[PDB]
Amino acid sequence: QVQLQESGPGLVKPSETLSVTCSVSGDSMNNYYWTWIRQSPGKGLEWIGYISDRESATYNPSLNSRVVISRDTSKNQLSLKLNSVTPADTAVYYCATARRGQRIYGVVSFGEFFYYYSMDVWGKGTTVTVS
């Protein structure tokens, strides 16, 4: 089963590198992708970077495209390298599941399919705040 456990420092000084990790237990390598979510400042769900299985970068433009995020799978961690932090993104980070689906409505050979994702299991999260 999928078990989540957030591990964040909590208190970090501004304009410094960050490192926040989550855990997933008993899971394969390339079965599904990895993502992150933020309900923080009590708003609608906001999307944050979702890395692929090959350490890629295609992230939400609506932050700054600022945070470099997890790839490493040494034993079990997802390390978030956030540089040049600002109080405007004080948040709690949830470690969620990312998977990719495919829907076709025409000729596949014409390059007409789009890619849609689904987020099954989400994490608990640990409150991280800037000073």
Partner: protein
């Protein structure tokens, strides 16, 4: 009285026109055509470009 008809926005999904050809039947017909052309062309190897 001059009414001009123009293409508006494509409602729904957007698709491109295409034509479907039965591959097996088309290939068989093309092979028969090549075989019948060979006699007219001294049994040369017929190639379509």
């Amino acid at each position: 009285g001059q009414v001009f008809y123009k293409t508006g926005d494509i409602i729904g999904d957007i698709r491109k026109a295409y034509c479907n050809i039965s591959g097996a039947q088309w290939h068989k017909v093309l092979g028969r055509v090549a075989n019948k052309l060979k006699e007219h062309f001294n049994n040369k190897t017929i190639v379509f470009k």
